[PDB]
């Protein structure tokens, strides 16, 4: 049985992210805000946001939130009110954001139909060998470096194997205008079927596609997963976040 997390005063939510300790993050789309939740909700000291979207967190707790309208990418290291704009150039309206275990930030440049990654402390961005995309959405990277991008404009989920540059399509059926993407340690990729108002998961090396028992979803989007396998998914139409334990 799903449960609604105690979130207050947010109009139209965007993405979601979960720490390694258990505290969840959300991007207050309409208030230009990045609210978190341990107790009672609270927002990080973000400065000068304008319609944020995706949100990811690092191993040390660094929160990575992008700005759709400002075409920026901001991060917050530890307990400080000092912001940092990542050296991303050419970002014309980016989409979600993911991070590697080594610190490499993955950004889905929506307006140009590409996915760009940037290593920690690097000034030169790197465009991934992704071919044949239309208005991409969420991005997710696992432990083996595999990049999971939701090529939204064609209702698919593409994959980029590490080392090689072979792009494959994940065996998904019934996908219509799909949004966020997530992945766990075992390899199960959680993709939010946004058009059918449902959250879907697909085990690694499996043909069976499983619809997650989420009740009351109105255009869901951002999807996250913690350690025990709890799936956190934001629904945009109801202005709330819902989690479902494994």
Q: Is 1-246 in CATH node 2.120.10.30? A: yes
Rounded to whole angstroms, the Cα distance separating 184 from 15 reads 17
What is the token pair recorded at 140? 């997710």
Cα–Cα distances in angstroms (integers) from residue 56 to residues 115, 155, 213, in the given order: 15, 23, 24
**Resolution of the experimentally solved model in angstroms:** 2.5
Q: Which of 32, 30, 15 is nearest to 140 (CA)?
A: 15
Cα–Cα distances in angstroms (integers) from residue 116 to residues 49, 69, 127, 146, 198, in the given order: 21, 18, 4, 14, 28
For the sheet with 231-235, list strands across it: 3-4, 240-244, 231-235, 220-225
Cα–Cα distances in angstroms (integers) from residue 33 to residues 82, 179, 228, in the given order: 15, 21, 28
Q: Where are the domains of the chain?
A: 1-246
Rounded to whole angstroms, the Cα distance separating 23 from 184 reads 17
| Structure determination method | X-ray
- Maximum separation of any 2 CA atoms in the chain, in Å: 47
Strands (E) across 38-155 are located at 42-43, 52-57, 63-67, 72-76, 84-85, 94-99, 105-109, 114-118, 126-127, 139-141, 147-149
Rounded to whole angstroms, the Cα distance separating 13 from 10 reads 7
């Amino acid at each position: 049985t799903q449960t609604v997390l105690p979130f207050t005063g947010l109009n139209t939510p965007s993405g979601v992210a979960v720490d390694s300790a258990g505290t969840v993050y959300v991007t207050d789309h309409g208030n230009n805000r990045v609210v978190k939740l341990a107790n009672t909700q609270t927002v990080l000291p973000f400065t000068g946001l304008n319609t944020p979207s995706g949100v990811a967190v690092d191993s040390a707790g660094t929160v990575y939130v992008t700005d759709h309208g400002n075409n920026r990418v901001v991060k917050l290291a530890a307990g400080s009110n000092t912001q940092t704009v990542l050296p991303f150039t050419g970002l014309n309206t980016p989409s979600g954001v993911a991070v590697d275990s080594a610190g490499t930030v993955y950004v889905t440049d929506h307006g140009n139909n590409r996915v760009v990654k940037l290593a920690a402390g690097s000034n030169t961005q790197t465009v991934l060998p992704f071919t044949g995309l239309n208005t991409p959405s969420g991005v997710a990277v696992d432990s083996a470096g595999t990049v999971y991008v939701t090529d939204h404009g064609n209702n698919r989920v593409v994959k980029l194997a590490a080392g090689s540059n072979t792009q494959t399509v994940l065996p998904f059926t019934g996908l219509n205008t799909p949004s966020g993407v997530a992945v766990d340690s075992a390899g199960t990729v959680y993709v939010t079927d946004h058009g059918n108002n449902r959250v879907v998961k697909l085990a690694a090396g499996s043909n069976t596609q499983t619809v997650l028992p989420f009740t009351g979803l109105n255009t869901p989007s951002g999807v996250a997963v913690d350690s025990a396998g709890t799936v956190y998914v934001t629904d945009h139409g109801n202005n709330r976040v819902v989690k479902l334990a494994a």
